[model samples]
Target: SMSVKKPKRDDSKDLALCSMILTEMETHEDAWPFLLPVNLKLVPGYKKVIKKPMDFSTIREKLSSGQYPNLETFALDVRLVFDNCETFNEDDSDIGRAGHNMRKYFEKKWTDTFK
Candidate 1:
């Protein structure tokens, strides 16, 4: 069996970083718009803001274009975006839950995918 070498960043710190950044953006009015375009799904009144490297679909585009240097950096950027976006709610919440779960799943196992 092959064991994956964990990243220098570590899982505990990674989850905390993701958690804090997420709450910070949600709590700040000026930063709230950054999360507007988070879900490409059928979210009501969803609008595109596209203002940063982590903006919706921007990272996806970049990834498709081979812009990232490595999986670690790419994963960090995903977390940065995850930090900015709201991925949970009351109605149609399963979609949000699914999104969060997938991101978390990647956070916990993406390194092994490359190795």
Candidate 2:
């Protein structure tokens, strides 16, 4: 029996949406903490604590390099940035507050665009 052919997905369009979201996120004021990788010199324990560190600059490079195969993978990396923050900083701390704010902003934007 012949299987049904699935329609081809427009990956470029999906990538564009991801890029848009990334651009907006980068411009956000609370995006400071997530803009670059945590400096190992400053936070020596960061590597030990965060097994897989992610940041906006890294995400942008990955996106541009076609490292993300789907939107979900892209979203996952974005969320990882905040998740790492929450794990490393106290809830009442400045960095933690920024992480919460940035995560909230990303989720809202994601829902508005996709949900």
Candidate 3:
């Protein structure tokens, strides 16, 4: 019901929800950040979401540094999983099948960026 605040940090970095499938979730956002906002897409009665999707490549790279066994962790990594599932297509199903696809989309050079 509350509005999702834009990340105060640079727009360059973010996790797969935005960077991979091309959505607005920031890689910098955690599964449980202190301030939570509802995405327009996830909202129940918005009818139409019209915010421009920001690019978050640099941030996603940085967040990937965390050690995760599977891509599902980004749900907690970006905090989108808990709230914005409808906003982006990278829901639980997407993570299970196309998780690694985003890594290639972003073209992460370091092995640490992903598994």
Candidate 4:
């Protein structure tokens, strides 16, 4: 039984950050997105309104070669998520239930594929 260690944040001395991220995502995204907090506040929010997925797939240009959908399709996905979610709590204001609903929706859909 091997346990993985959480990486130090924004520290240049302890490299291997990218591999750690990919590993953590693989190890924990389904249950908790790894539950690790990074310099999330430092990251800029949608520079160009993220009209499409291409504007986002790069993620500060890190994943520039990654696959991403066009602007229209990205907007459609966002709208679809908003429309299908039944737990949009206006009072919360800060994307809580809405996010859970999205996860639940995907979980069900993914399980449906196998069943």
Candidate 5:
């Protein structure tokens, strides 16, 4: 199985996966710190990013403003959050299990979308 590479642009699948995760994150706000990178969450106006979980238009606009060169970098940033969750979990912790599931969900989406 070939590993997926970051997208050159934001593909529908990439946006789909990211949007789903962000939408789900709305229900799991506690998981924000677990899902988002440290820098993003720490930045000013971070609140606007998550202001509308399912609607990432603002964040998308910010990205278009030139933070990341491509959607691959942006999507990968989100993916890394789930990766860290899986790595940090001990399997017994509740959030740990959630993180693992989150990783699997998005990872599966990647294959499903590409395959």
Candidate 6:
């Protein structure tokens, strides 16, 4: 038996999938800390420690503005958010745990949706 397959690379489909994943992450319980950029005043030395900070709002804006050339770039920004979280927060800390949770959730979604 033979099976028909759709084109594997579709820009519109990739964009929609990126939006869907972002929305789900935004609504996740552990998303609070990552909703927006870390306040420099609130988090002293944050900027010094984390050179490139990424967050949900920034990702959304980038997506809406068509800043990402492809889904891989979009995924990089998403992972950056989590990586930054782990860099600045301890594994046992609340924010750090939230980052772990969010990263795990994202990995599952990515695999299910694209991999």
Q: TM-score of every model?
A: 0.39, 0.91, 0.20, 0.24, 0.45, 0.90
- Cα misplacement distance, residue 55 of candidate 2 (Å): 0.3
Provide the overall lDDT of each model, using Cα atoms, as 2-decimal numbers: 0.49, 0.93, 0.37, 0.35, 0.53, 0.93
List the candidates ranked by TM-score, beginning with the highest. 2, 6, 5, 1, 4, 3
Tell me the lDDT of model 5 at 83.
57
Q: Which candidate, 2 or 4, would have the higher TM-score against the true structure?
A: 2
What residue runs in model 4 are displaced by over 4 Å at the alpha carbon?
1-91
Candidate 2 collision pairs: none
Off by over 4 Å in 5: 1-21, 24-66
What TM-score does candidate 2 reach?
0.91
Per-residue lDDT of 94 in model 2: 92
Model 5 quality (TM-score): 0.45
lDDT of 4 by residue, 6-115 (tens): 87444342223333332333343332321222223553543233333221113223323333233333234433333323222342544445446445554453344323
lDDT of 6 by residue, 1-115 (tens): 2698776665669989999999999999989999998998888889798999999999999999989999999999999999999888899999999999999999999999998
Q: After best superposition, candidate 3 residue 82: deviation in angstroms?
A: 7.8
Model 4 worst lDDT run, 10 consecutive residues: 51-60
Which should have the higher TM-score, number 1 or number 3?
A: 1
Q: Which candidate number has the best TM-score?
A: 2
Model 3 lDDT-worst window of ten: 26-35
For model 1, residues 3-99, the per-residue Cα lDDT tens digits are 8665564344444343343454344444333444456465554444333425534655555576765556666776766553443343245544544
